[PDB]
């Protein structure tokens, strides 16, 4: 099945500026991005630790 850890970060339609983490497969690390507040995809984490635990090594 498609690895959700490899999907580009999704800001969504909502207009908040919430900092979340996503696994950047190209760089091999969890990076920060702007999340809009709703309709989050799975490659969206509240902390670097959550991101690494879920997507580390993808």
């Amino acid at each position: 099945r498609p690895d959700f850890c490899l999907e580009p970060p999704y800001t969504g339609p909502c207009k908040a500026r919430i900092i979340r983490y996503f696994y950047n497969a190209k760089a091999g690390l969890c990076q920060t991005f702007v999340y809009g507040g709703s309709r989050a995809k799975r490659n969206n984490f509240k902390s670097a630790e959550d991101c690494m635990r879920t997507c580390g090594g993808a």
């Binding site: 339609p13 909502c14 908040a16 500026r17 809009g36 709703s38 309709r39």
Partner: protein, 223 residues
């Protein structure tokens, strides 16, 4: 805010910033102890920042007050974004004067074409990223329900309204959510969502505050 202008220090006294270690949403002060924002702006450890202009520097007129309660509308749907409204109670009453003031709730809904003031510390670029230090303002008109539905097929509910310019270039953007849309001195909208920011044929969508006045008043009074 994309395509707007610098409001001027404390020229929008009801505009507040929601902070969770950084600015993430806006809000509107409706009385000394209550703020109206968007349901999708619900976050842990919210601190409401009043009397703000430069969001990155202490200028002397700020009041930082923690949220003691955050009541998301009981019918908020995170998928459809229907009922995107939240009420925040201030842990201690804010000191109201000229620089920190409340905005009146509407007595009736505003008609299409009505000019309104939209404000916030959100992204100022339609393509790219640039967040302002000072508060940004934008004058935009309320758009018809028909035009709103045509722009966003099967997405506009009775609790949403569009505002802006169809040609693009002027709109609210990421970081503006929860903020005000004030028309003729009344809070008619809450910055909610849209397809990107300032894109042609994609005006901003806002929560229709006029549909929640009774709920707001009763909820505030029961908390």
């Amino acid at each position: 805010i994309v395509g707007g202008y610098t409001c001027g220090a404390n020229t929008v006294p009801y505009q507040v910033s929601l902070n969770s270690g950084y600015h993430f949403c806006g809000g509107s002060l409706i009385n000394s102890q209550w703020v109206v924002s968007a349901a999708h702006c619900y976050k842990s450890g919210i601190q409401v920042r009043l009397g703000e202009d430069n969001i990155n520097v202490v200028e002397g007129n700020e009041q930082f007050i923690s949220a003691s309660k955050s009541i998301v509308h009981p019918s908020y749907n995170s998928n459809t974004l229907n009922n995107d409204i939240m009420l925040i109670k201030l842990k201690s009453a804010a000191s109201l004067x000229s620089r920190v003031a409340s905005i009146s709730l509407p007595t009736s809904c505003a008609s299409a074409g009505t000019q309104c003031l939209i404000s916030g510390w959100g992204n100022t670029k339609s393509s790219g990223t640039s967040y302002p230090d000072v508060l940004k303002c934008l004058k935009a008109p309320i758009l018809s329900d028909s035009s709103c539905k045509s722009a966003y097929p099967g997405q506009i509910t009775s609790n949403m309204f569009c505002a802006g310019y169809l040609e693009g270039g002027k709109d609210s953007c990421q970081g503006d959510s929860g903020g005000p849309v004030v028309c003729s001195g009344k809070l008619q909208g809450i910055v909610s969502w849209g397809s990107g920011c300032a894109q042609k044929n994609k005006p901003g969508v806002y929560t229709k505050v006029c549909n929640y006045v009774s709920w707001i008043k009763q909820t505030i009074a029961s908390n």
